[model samples]
Target: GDTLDVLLPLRTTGEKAPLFCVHPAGGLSWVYSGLMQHIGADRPLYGLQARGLADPSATLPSSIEEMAADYVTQIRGVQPSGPYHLLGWALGSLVIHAMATQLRAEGEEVGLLVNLDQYPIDRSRPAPESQPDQQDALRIMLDFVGYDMDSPLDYAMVADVLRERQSVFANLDETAITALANVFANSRSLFGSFAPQPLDSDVLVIVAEPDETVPAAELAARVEQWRPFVTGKIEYQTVRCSHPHMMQPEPAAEIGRLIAEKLG
Candidate 1:
């Protein structure tokens, strides 16, 4: 097999179909580490680590078009075969959508595009001009977790599960961090500027409850708005967990089960 610097395929035996996993902005493929165990050895899982985040030497693009182009190349390199399954989390969902559109244009089969917790919200909607200062950013994060500003648990939880992983987080090279920050800050423009269009394939949306970034109800509404664009069946499922469920063992296992059941 060919070597890939960023995207690694945890190959499985047998001629099972392939599932491509797209990592979020941080470029941490470790998030999907235990997923293959749940999916079993019969199926192959290819984790697609984003360019700049995964590969220190990889150049990053500032626009969605450029990002999509890079992903298209990766897809072609890995599974030049016709149809494939795609899954993405958070910002990774944007990349997945672009890849799906590109592959479909080339007459490839896209079995399912599973979006985890992100919705096709209109990016042009008014957003705060800038992220508030560190204090404010922490406050905003707490709000998403439904915690009062006075609650210590919110801060502790964030610190323990997210912030404390500085070693892992720090592993991301400087260039990748800068590129991710830029994309995160400008996501509104990136998502909103694009024209509203229907997806050409089936979409299975899995929404997380008590989500820190995107609420389940809000995501459901957004899915309804974009349902018309999908020519295949539109299905939704609510996972009983939070935003970082995919990283936690129990929740991650459940998520893998849901995906396997839906797409099996």
Candidate 2:
């Protein structure tokens, strides 16, 4: 089924504690599916997407706390207990961090918290001065498709090109694109305003070796920022790929191997 539900089950048969992969800024968890084959088949995997992806009319979460709390409830409904395994990318890193903190507060155990290439937002920095609009959403969608638009950016052009390209966005209309834009804008805003809480759990950060937007030294410094928010051991692993491409098959497979080894 190609349904865009909030809780997407990539693999349902496994004895291990299920790994719940949270969504990125785009509010869809489908990209996490790439890791399914890499992870052991017996290790179940699920994805936690944003509220408004499936139905654009759904009310979006107003704050990071609200979003994390909502996801925690959904994950608990599946396992009903802990040593939970949580993994996330981009904005999802922050979401999982919050989830781990909440789980610990409720006296539950989090086996591992995995972050893929995204660092926490610096509190000292001001939030984005401008909110994302439809064109920004179109650009994000285009990037997800790995397409570079040579022509001027327009909603109709994006829709036409996406259909021609035959990607996930192919089926989406202009209205759906607008909803995605809203999700992107709201998620981005929430991330900027969020203040992370300290967690008494271990963290594994899988660093992407190449990032065009952020320098390597800067990324290292940002990863170090996790120290204040995490009291337990913070470990680092690296995959030789760009951050945007981290979830692709090869890198995702490497990530799965690293995660399986850590779990063992």
Candidate 3:
């Protein structure tokens, strides 16, 4: 169950075909805690964290494809069948898409892929993004943990607090310190270099409104990017808030309702 080492179950409602959620760039699954609340009591849910995030001896996948391959095997350990349901937020959108492709390639069925307002990553596209720097990692992780930048704790210390705070890492030892750093270090490219392939299954996109950061037209165009890569049905549902707020408690319940409808 080495793969189980990478899974964090938010809900274990039943043997019902589970929804496997891919983590965002932070590579932690606990962030989905709010969203899991609205899901049906009978529906199974498992969140997939990045391979090296909490496990000291576990080596991480270098790319999205590698990560997806590992997950396909891990998922089989639970469901062991077709018609998988997958969802991802932000960088997770790209990871779940890749996982869908892998599962289908191996002759399985992906019933649905719900992407949360993230445009696909194109390494060959213009505006090339370099891998994340330390500041970028700190900002994203701290935001997820609701920690302030001007706080007395630095990134390392805050990460220590986080590892200790989350139950998933309560059993962690000294090596977990280095492992947390390595998770963010390695995931930069995992987020940066992803290039998607056409999915044989349907995709449901739950979008966020376009703000000055990403105007509506621009977001529309970005969502259109999925059209070419997915031969199956593509649908969109727009949430009123920004990316960060969409997953918050209130909106997460709404998002969960929409997801339950699809999962039904």
Candidate 4:
């Protein structure tokens, strides 16, 4: 089965250039619902849904490279016209970069590569084993955004938000849950295995000012290292928000403005 399940706002004609938005780990394309309004409405926006996460019946790849390659295959099958543009948030950044490289190798034109607060680092960097537990991670994520995890509204908000958006997979079926679990379990080496490469197109790195997930200074330095490979252009901008700002309208709007100025 195909890795992507497209959601079109309306049926259309003409050669609408494609913009592919890839999601983070445990995320679906629906996370970009807040972003769609800010992008160019004149073209077709295609959200590449991860196979296992989007459909329970689909198989999940064990490694990040395999997952990315699968997505490339899905995109080729759909054959969206170029000049192609790609956007990725969080873990999805790795996938988008890999996809961009693959496309470039195939002689495709990539108009822009938008990296939203994701740094390509060796995930195996030794750290204290005192990593936050599941509940603690949940709590910290909520607190980072000024939401009280213990509050009833917090739970309701998460539920309602997921329900309203078709991409949130918190309520996925049993088969999908199992697939996701397997994919994550086998993905420990994924990030550490990433050998950083130079981007070969107009690359824009949009960061969140107070992002706890990836530091701004570190992200800037990584972009510097990545600047050599791309023949197009490179730019960086920071949005005033937290890690999950992609789901928030204001920050998303700021990012949209940057994309318009840079990619348009």
Candidate 5:
């Protein structure tokens, strides 16, 4: 079967220079289907999902640097130039920052960097090995893909219930699940440890209205973490929606429209 180990073209519509959407921690490209659909036909939308997702034995990139190297090299195969437009969700958004940095170091210019719904992290708060235990990974992975275990909170039985119900996002075995957990953990660890490499691109942050979990008063302070990382203009917009629903048509519609405006 043709799985998503490479860049998958969602809407190959036209020649306005495509926007590359990075994958979430679940490593699925289909999550952005609605994102591209809402963006209309102005430009092609290309998505890069996690490699080796379908193949359990295949070792995924050990770090964000490794992942960035592979993606930047492949992206040039299609469009070999500067001013690349990029966007990503959650953990993928963080990876997008790293990717943009690598491109500039290679003498490339990143156009608009759109970061969606990701909060600032203070490495000590999470990302040390102690965080995102197996159960945390399972819970987050399922929620990101719109599933709930509906079973007991036992980490021991993760493989059982997951295999019982085939996933709409990803169909995998015990081996794949274990590998995914590792990937998620590693990605988060890198995210926590990341100090912005400050790129030439400005960031357009479309943040969700802070929910009960995080106070609205803290949004600006939290946003400051990103300010130091960009040499370009920083713009901000707020969506009434929440993080979990950012990928849906409603939220994505507004997010995509604003992104298109910025990209233009």
Candidate 6:
């Protein structure tokens, strides 16, 4: 199966409701496949990658609302109805929330929504002191390909690295690399511009405890941020992992197990 495929069916033969996991900043959802062993075998699983990752020419949505609208339509085309189960990490989490909101607006049911390691931005707060740039996008692309360069590299440098060494599990040529970076940058912008709307579905927020990335106060704020945007009860679960490594095997297993418990 092509990793760049927008929709990758992980498990297709199951009577239980399907779980659709959305892609993170890199626009690849293959990481969710790790959950299969921990999640019940009787349940179906699907990974929704970003369209831009699959097709370099595809137009990335300008706003988070537009991205959610498109993804909701895509999922409906697959399941055609809900009680939809959605899970996403980082940028994917925001998208999933919007997706749930859109589905509820359309009179569809969102059975479960799992937001992994992301907090809603207080739209009332002031903008960042420094906005992200091409360098930041390149860094995200590089990280996705399994490289953590100490110094930021430009597009040309990153492309040269990709051409010289086929990194990780990707057949990433210059075009796909370019698209990945663009999608990362676009996702960042969409997140910045996004204003989350209220949704009726209860949310399960998975927090990566002991995350040194944010202060403890900010960590508390992450869960609180969801309060204004969700009408239903917001439940929480703590996992022993950091924000970036939440999808790693041990952490993913715990997450998968938690989700399975929720499903039952």
Identify the superior model by TM-score, candidate 4 or candidate 6.
6
The TM-score ranking, best first, is: 2, 6, 3, 5, 4, 1
Residue 1's lDDT within candidate 4 is 25
C-alpha lDDT of residue 214 in model 5: 67
Name the runs in model 3 displaced over 4 angstroms. 1-4, 125-157, 160-177, 210-219
Residue pairs with backbone atoms closer than 3 Å in model 6 (clashes): none
The numbered model that scores best in lDDT is 2
State the lDDT of candidate 4 residue by residue for 1-264, as single tens digits. 222253322212225565677766544465565555666666456666556544556556656667777777766655554666788776667778888887777888777788876665635672222111223222322332334333522333443344344333345445554554544444344556665456567788786566566776776785665554566676788777755544565677888766666556
User: Which is superior by TM-score, 1 or 6?
Assistant: 6
lDDT of each: 0.59, 0.77, 0.70, 0.58, 0.67, 0.76
Winner on lDDT (1 vs 4): 1
Off by over 4 Å in 5: 125-178, 210-217
Q: Please, what are the lDDT tens digits per residue for candidate 1 over residues 1-264?
A: 122245666664546677787765444444565667677566778777655444445555666556666766776686678567888776567667777877778787878688776655545563332211223323323332334344323334543334334344433344544554443445444555544355678787776675466756676685665575677777777776655454455656777887777556
Q: Model 2, 1-264: lDDT tens per residue?
A: 354687888788988889999987777776677777777777889999888867888989998889999999989888899599999877788899999989999999999899987776765774342222345445544554456545446656766776676555567767776776678789777866888899898899888776456567765675776898999988877787856567766687899888888777
Which candidate leads in TM-score?
A: 2
Better of 4 and 5 by TM-score: 5
Residue-by-residue lDDT tens digits, candidate 3, 1-264 = 222257877777675688888776656666666666777667788888887755567767888899888777777787889588888877678788988988888888888788977775556652324233455444445554555445533556656666556545444555655665777677666765777888877888877673546666665666777987899877777777656455655567778888878777
| Worst 10 contiguous positions by lDDT, candidate 1 | 129-138
Position 158, candidate 3: lDDT? 55
Residue 44 lDDT (model 5) = 80
Give per-residue CA lDDT, model 5, range 149-242, as digits (tens): 4544443354455445435423555566666665565665566666557767788777767464666647666555577677777667777765
**What is the total number of backbone clashes in candidate 4?**
1
Judging by lDDT, tell me the better candidate of 2 and 4.
2
